[PDB]
């Protein structure tokens, strides 16, 4: 602590007086990861491996919740053509936890497959499928041209070119209504001032990249709108009380001391916030208990010494911290 | 930034993507201290006068 | 008439000792 | 005299993460200026008594 | 079932006021001894709340649903057993429906074929629809017990419902307390979140009736329909998490 | 509106520069057999320079 005076002041010698040096550092011991016990894996193979799919104008939205996810086919193993994520880190998929997911299954040809991104402009990117700027999820594509193609072409899958205005995202168009430019009524069929928006895909194996069909499944993640029951295979440890430790509580991380809450709380409450809007209290995921969070490493270090021409003895002042409980 | 919690930035994003959003949150907390300590020098000058 | 690292420095001259000079 | 305060940059800016303490050193002596400014207030408040 | 009542006479649209009422919990986050500013769709204070009365005088208007409503129902014999939501009110589009068979609350989203003026009939039978198919949602609630026995007299309790559409999700906030409207202030606890995802442009009120659909009679009850505006409230939180005060900014 | 024409290799370009062309009455009438193009809508050509 004589040389802690020389380190903070950036000087070779010591002047006589009292100098503020540093603060306490309390190292955490263990790490606590809490996730509830669910023996059911998530049905990710039902949306990927199914025989018949839907179109780009009307898709099949599969709500998947209250399970344990398997990300090893989407991260370590690569059966699939490309991995495109935007707001989520692909390595951190197994770390973070979300409530539910909405899978959108649609087949887009390889010329038009570059229009799937937030904030694009195109035929699919205006009148069919959009993404918002706050969208959270990933885009997974795979080449289907050895299976779903046909020599004469596959007209069973369909798409719609035309719409009167720009379509809002997360909305399916089920309307069979003929697009009417003028004042002539269509009466269900094409004609003068009546165009038919519904088209069929170009899919053949013999042609190039733009005729190759791709199976695109886009996942939509919902973060902190609800309690989070869905993430990867993370383990679980015991709760440690009266110790400064690292926290992982349902994806939320921190450092503190777990103490018992004496107040009356909501049964649906996941966590709660202080005057600074940080989490001071959180419900346990497996059993119903709410434990408070009291942070560690508080108080300063002040030294009192004579200078280098007098004596090397250093008196150390701990400010604000009781020394009955208790720098290298 | 998207969230003010520093555990909700670095653990939720790429390490190239975190260091843009962390350095916005540090510089906003440096400007909150540069409004504080400059106010403590002006208001103590009225006390010492 | 807190946990974020905000420390209030105590005064050197206590209010009992201010009245001793008074 | 007035209330003598001291503000640490470790607990206020950082949420006890290893990334925040590593990126604080790139800004350098900005918190060296603020701790010497609050020290020089607290010397002169004892000279007022 | 399809035959409506000939004993009904529609009343006028009288108005009353909601003093401090209409303030709910905007989130599940506990805060203590603070003052929070919440921007959400809220009722203006000292506004016009439309006064309805069911007593041979029956009042069941068809009212539009824009953003969100408040339902404050003042009952004795518990006449309102359900609600009807939807847009075009036929089998072409989807519709939302709340069915209480007094064992639980059955909430399903299917293709519903509505009648001209469908009514509800202990329980004889409940039929609001001829047939249904294409069901994307089913819900079974917690068991409870209620009474269909008709009574007339003073009204000893207050039931307030919050039915809103926030980001495609249908949230239900309700609080029951004992007490043509009383004043006071209270808060409304969360109940259940329903991921429906269907737009609603209209609503109407179901009424369950008894006998001692032609000769069915009823007791006395009242219910209120509110509206929402994008306004800002201040919210006081105590140590127990119960809101004791609310201040609207732009009124005064 | 031209009466005459040419063949598929004999085609003569019409130079359109420094003038205001009206395409807006043709899109509201449209006695057109088939129009097909890629990436640029023909109805969005009216407000662009």
């Amino acid at each position: 602590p004589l040389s802690e005076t020389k380190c903070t002041l950036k000087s070779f010698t010591v002047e006589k007086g009292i100098y503020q040096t540093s603060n306490f550092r309390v190292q955490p011991t263990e790490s606590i990861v809490r996730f509830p016990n669910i023996t059911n894996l998530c049905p990710f193979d039902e949306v990927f491996n199914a025989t018949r799919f839907a179109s780009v104008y009307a898709w099949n939205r599969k709500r998947i919740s209250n399970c344990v996810a398997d990300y090893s086919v989407l991260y370590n193993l690569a059966p699939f053509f490309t991995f495109k994520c935007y707001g989520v880190s692909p390595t951190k998929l197994n770390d973070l936890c979300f409530t539910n997911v909405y899978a959108d299954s649609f087949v887009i040809r390889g010329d038009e497959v570059r229009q799937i991104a937030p904030g694009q402009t195109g035929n699919i990117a205006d009148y069919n499928y959009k993404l918002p700027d706050d969208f959270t999820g990933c885009v997974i594509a795979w080449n289907s041209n050895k299976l779903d193609s046909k020599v004469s072409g596959n007209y069973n899958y369909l798409y719609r070119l035309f719409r009167k205005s720009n379509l809002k995202p997360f909305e399916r168009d089920i309307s069979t209504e003929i697009y009417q430019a003028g004042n002539k009524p269509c009466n269900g069929v094409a004609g003068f001032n009546c165009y038919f928006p519904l088209r069929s895909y170009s899919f053949r194996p013999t042609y190039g990249v733009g005729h190759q069909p791709y199976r695109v499944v886009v996942l939509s993640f919902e973060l902190l709108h609800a309690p989070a029951t869905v993430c990867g295979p993370k383990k679980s440890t015991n709760l440690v009380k009266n110790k400064c430790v690292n926290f992982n509580f349902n994806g939320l991380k921190g450092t503190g001391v777990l103490t018992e809450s004496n107040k009356k709380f909501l049964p649906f409450q996941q966590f709660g916030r202080d005057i600074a809007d940080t989490t001071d209290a959180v419900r346990d995921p497996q059993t119903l208990e709410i434990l408070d969070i009291t942070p560690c490493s508080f108080g300063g270090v002040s030294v009192i010494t004579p200078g280098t021409n007098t004596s090397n003895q250093v008196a150390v002042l701990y400010q604000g911290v009781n020394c009955t409980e208790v720098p290298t | 930034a998207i969230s003010s919690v520093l555990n909700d930035i670095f653990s939720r994003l790429d390490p190239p993507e975190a260091e843009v959003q962390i350095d916005r949150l540090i510089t906003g907390r440096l400007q909150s201290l540069q409004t504080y300590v400059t106010q403590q020098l002006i208001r103590a000058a009225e006390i010492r006068a | 008439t807190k946990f974020k690292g905000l420390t209030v420095l105590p005064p050197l001259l206590t209010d009992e000792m201010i009245a001793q000079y008074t | 005299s007035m209330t003598k305060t001291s503000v640490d940059c470790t607990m206020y800016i950082c949420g006890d993460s290893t990334e925040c303490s590593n990126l604080l050193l790139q800004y350098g002596s900005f918190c060296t200026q603020l701790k010497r400014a609050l020290t020089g207030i607290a010397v002169e408040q004892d000279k007022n008594t | 079932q399809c035959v409506n009542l000939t004993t009904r006479t529609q009343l006028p649209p009288a108005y009353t006021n909601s003093f401090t009422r209409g303030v709910y919990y905007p989130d599940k986050v506990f805060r203590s001894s603070v003052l929070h500013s919440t921007q959400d769709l809220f009722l203006p204070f000292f506004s016009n709340v439309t006064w309805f009365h069911v007593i041979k005088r029956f009042d069941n208007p068809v009212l539009p649903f824009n953003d969100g409503v408040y339902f404050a129902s003042i009952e004795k014999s518990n006449i309102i057993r359900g609600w009807i939501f939807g847009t075009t009110l036929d089998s072409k589009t989807q519709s939302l429906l709340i069915v209480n068979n007094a064992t639980n609350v059955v909430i399903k989203v299917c293709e519903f074929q509505f009648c001209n003026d469908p009514f509800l009939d202990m329980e004889s039978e409940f039929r609001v629809y001829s047939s249904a198919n294409n069901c994307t949602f089913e819900y079974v609630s917690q068991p409870f017990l209620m009474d269909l026995e008709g009574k007339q007299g003073n009204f000893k309790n207050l039931r307030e419902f919050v039915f809103k559409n926030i980001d495609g999700y249908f949230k239900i906030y309700s609080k029951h307390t004992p007490i043509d409207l009383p004043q006071g202030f209270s808060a409304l606890e969360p109940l259940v979140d329903l991921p429906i995802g269907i737009n609603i442009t209209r609503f109407q009120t179901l009424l369950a009736l008894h006998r001692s659909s032609s000769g069915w009679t009823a007791g006395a009850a009242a219910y209120y329909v509110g509206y929402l505006q994008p306004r800002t409230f201040l919210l006081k939180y105590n140590e127990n998490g119960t809101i004791t005060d609310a201040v609207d900014c732009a009124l005064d």
Side-chain angles (χ1 to χ4, degrees), chain A residues 54-62 103-105 127-129 160 163 167-175, chain E residues 94 136 196-198:
Chain A
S55 296
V56 66
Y57 60 92
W59 58 89
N60 291 336
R61 180 181 294 177
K62 179 62 174 172
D104 293 345
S105 178
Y127 298 139
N128 289 283
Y129 181 77
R160 295 182 181 273
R163 196 180 181 273
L167 179 61
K168 294 176 178 178
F170 293 155
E171 184 178 2
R172 293 174 296 181
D173 193 8
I174 60 172
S175 63
Chain E
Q94 295 298 319
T136 59
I196 305 300
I198 303 301

Side-chain angles (χ1 to χ4, degrees), chain E residues 106-151:
Chain E
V106 177
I107 296 170
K108 292 177 179 177
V109 178
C110 305
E111 291 178 349
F112 287 140
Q113 184 63 59
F114 289 152
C115 296
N116 292 336
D117 194 5
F119 290 150
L120 290 174
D121 291 344
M122 292 178 70
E123 178 182 0
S124 296
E125 191 179 2
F126 289 152
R127 297 291 180 268
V128 293
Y129 63 96
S130 296
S131 64
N133 45 30
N134 290 337
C135 295
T136 59
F137 179 77
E138 289 177 350
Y139 177 73
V140 175
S141 68
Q142 295 298 319
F144 55 91
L145 179 63
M146 290 179 180
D147 291 344
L148 286 171
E149 182 179 2
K151 291 176 179 177

Side-chain angles (χ1 to χ4, degrees), chain A residues 136-177:
Chain A
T136 300
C138 296
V139 176
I140 294 103
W142 181 80
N143 201 346
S144 62
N145 61 341
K146 294 177 180 177
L147 295 175
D148 290 344
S149 64
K150 193 175 179 180
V151 179
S152 63
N154 190 30
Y155 298 141
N156 291 337
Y157 295 141
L158 297 174
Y159 65 97
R160 295 182 181 273
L161 291 173
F162 292 153
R163 196 180 181 273
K164 295 177 180 177
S165 63
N166 289 337
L167 179 61
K168 294 176 178 178
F170 293 155
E171 184 178 2
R172 293 174 296 181
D173 193 8
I174 60 172
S175 63
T176 59
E177 185 179 2

Side-chain angles (χ1 to χ4, degrees), chain A residues 38-274:
Chain A
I38 294 170
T39 59
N40 291 336
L41 296 175
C42 295
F44 290 155
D45 291 344
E46 291 180 350
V47 290
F48 289 160
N49 291 283
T51 303
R52 297 285 181 264
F53 288 157
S55 296
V56 66
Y57 60 92
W59 58 89
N60 291 336
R61 180 181 294 177
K62 179 62 174 172
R63 182 182 64 197
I64 295 170
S65 64
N66 201 31
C67 52
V68 176
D70 192 8
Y71 293 134
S72 64
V73 294
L74 295 175
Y75 177 72
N76 284 332
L77 296 175
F80 293 150
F81 178 75
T82 183
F83 292 152
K84 293 177 179 177
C85 293
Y86 296 138
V88 190
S89 178
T91 63
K92 294 175 178 179
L93 292 170
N94 56 343
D95 291 344
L96 300 175
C97 301
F98 52 89
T99 302
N100 45 30
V101 62
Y102 297 140
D104 293 345
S105 178
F106 49 88
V107 177
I108 290 174
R109 59 177 182 182
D111 181 67
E112 292 175 348
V113 78
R114 66 183 183 273
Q115 295 298 319
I116 306 300
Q120 293 298 319
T121 300
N123 290 337
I124 302 171
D126 291 344
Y127 298 139
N128 289 283
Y129 181 77
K130 290 182 178 296
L131 293 173
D133 291 344
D134 55 350
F135 176 74
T136 300
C138 296
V139 176
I140 294 103
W142 181 80
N143 201 346
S144 62
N145 61 341
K146 294 177 180 177
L147 295 175
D148 290 344
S149 64
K150 193 175 179 180
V151 179
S152 63
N154 190 30
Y155 298 141
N156 291 337
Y157 295 141
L158 297 174
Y159 65 97
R160 295 182 181 273
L161 291 173
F162 292 153
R163 196 180 181 273
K164 295 177 180 177
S165 63
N166 289 337
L167 179 61
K168 294 176 178 178
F170 293 155
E171 184 178 2
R172 293 174 296 181
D173 193 8
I174 60 172
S175 63
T176 59
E177 185 179 2
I178 308 299
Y179 176 75
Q180 185 175 354
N183 291 336
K184 180 65 174 172
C186 300
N187 291 283
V189 294
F192 178 76
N193 287 336
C194 294
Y195 296 138
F196 185 72
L198 183 66
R199 296 295 180 191
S200 62
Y201 290 96
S202 63
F203 295 154
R204 288 180 183 173
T206 59
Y207 292 145
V209 184
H211 293 82
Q212 290 177 335
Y214 292 140
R215 291 178 182 174
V216 176
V217 176
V218 175
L219 297 174
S220 178
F221 294 155
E222 296 298 318
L223 178 62
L224 296 175
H225 300 292
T229 59
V230 176
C231 34
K234 301 302 287 185
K235 294 177 179 177
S236 64
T237 58
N238 291 336
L239 293 174
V240 177
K241 294 177 179 178
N242 203 30
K243 189 185 292 179
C244 298
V245 288
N246 289 336
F247 292 154
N248 196 342
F249 292 147
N250 206 31
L252 178 63
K253 295 176 180 177
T255 301
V257 172
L258 295 173
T259 56
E260 185 178 2
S261 297
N262 290 283
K263 295 177 179 177
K264 294 176 179 177
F265 291 149
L266 296 174
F268 292 153
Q269 177 178 352
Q270 186 176 354
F271 59 94
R273 294 183 182 274
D274 60 351

